[PDB]
Amino acid sequence: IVGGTASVRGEWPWQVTLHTTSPTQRHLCGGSIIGNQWILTAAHCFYGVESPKILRVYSGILNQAEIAEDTSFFGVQEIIIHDQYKMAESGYDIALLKLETTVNYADSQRPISLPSKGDRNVIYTDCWVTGWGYRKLRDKIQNTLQKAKIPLVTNEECQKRYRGHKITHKMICAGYREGGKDACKGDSGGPLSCKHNEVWHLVGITSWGEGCAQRERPGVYTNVVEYVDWILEKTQAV
Numbered sequence: 001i002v003g004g005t006a007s008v009r010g011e012w013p014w015q016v017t018l019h020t021t022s023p024t025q026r027h028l029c030g031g032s033i034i035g036n037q038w039i040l041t042a043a044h045c046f047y048g049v050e051s052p053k054i055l056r057v058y059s060g061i062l063n064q065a066e067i068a069e070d071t072s073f074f075g076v077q078e079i080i081i082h083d084q085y086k087m088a089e090s091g092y093d094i095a096l097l098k099l100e101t102t103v104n105y106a107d108s109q110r111p112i113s114l115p116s117k118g119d120r121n122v123i124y125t126d127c128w129v130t131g132w133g134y135r136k137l138r139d140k141i142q143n144t145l146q147k148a149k150i151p152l153v154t155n156e157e158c159q160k161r162y163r164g165h166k167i168t169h170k171m172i173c174a175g176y177r178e179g180g181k182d183a184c185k186g187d188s189g190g191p192l193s194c195k196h197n198e199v200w201h202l203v204g205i206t207s208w209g210e211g212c213a214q215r216e217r218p219g220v221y222t223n224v225v226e227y228v229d230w231i232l233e234k235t236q237a238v
């Protein structure tokens with residue numbers, strides 16, 4: 001996260017840090033708890049990953065330092081990638097992680113509600129992006145979870161900032177014309193929480209952007225509302 005500040009412990013109870021154990025353990029991506037056994041994250045976070053066995057999901061974490069060899073975590077039983085996904089910049093950058101065990105909700109770890117289709121007309125003016133990502137272009141994973149308040153921009157506005165790209169309605173952007181605040185590498189999979197009428201909603205999933213926090217270069221996120229049907233279908237038992 002560029003231009004943000006340290007979050008308060010438990011401030012974003014749905015935020016998780018996804019680690020890979022190969023070659024040695026490290027933070028890989030952010031993610032959001034949306035169900036007792038489900039983490040919603042970005043598809044492009046599993047590039048080169050051929051098994052959920054090397055994945056570990058840690059919930060209720062503020063500082064990466066809290067994670068040690070003796071820290072409990074949730075194993076991943078299955079990685080579900082949207083079958084239409086090719087690459088972050090082309091859309092469909094969404095994935096579900098089915099946990100091996102159930103998450104016991106508490107003040108430190110709880111789910112974030114998904115957007116309602118009848119909320120596409122809603123104007124979120126209190127949106128935040130969080131993560132342990134880079135604080136600048138060339139940086140490293142941060143110890144303390146960062147947060148930054150960033151305004152959403154219209155797709156037409158976004159498309160105008162990414163002429164060589166195709167900003168579809170399945171994407172949503174957020175940024176300041178002058179830049180300064182934005183998600184970055186390491187925040188991928190992160191949630192783009194917006195609080196509307198005292199209720200937090202998972203509006204987007206950190207996906208991509210040209211550099212980080214550059215002027216006239218909004219962050220691009222997966223437009224979650226466009227995937228509620230997909231999420232429902234994939235999280236069923238059938």
Ligand SMILES: COC(=O)c1cc(NC(=O)c2cccc(O)c2C)c2cc(C(=N)N)ccc2c1
Binds near residue numbers: 136206212213
């Ligand atoms: C794993 O995900 C990414 O590669 C990756 C690469 C990016 N864009 C870059 O240009 C970049 C930033 C830092 C280091 C780096 O090498 C690059 C190419 C990203 C930019 C944003 C955003 N601005 N909202 C968010 C997530 C990103 C994830």
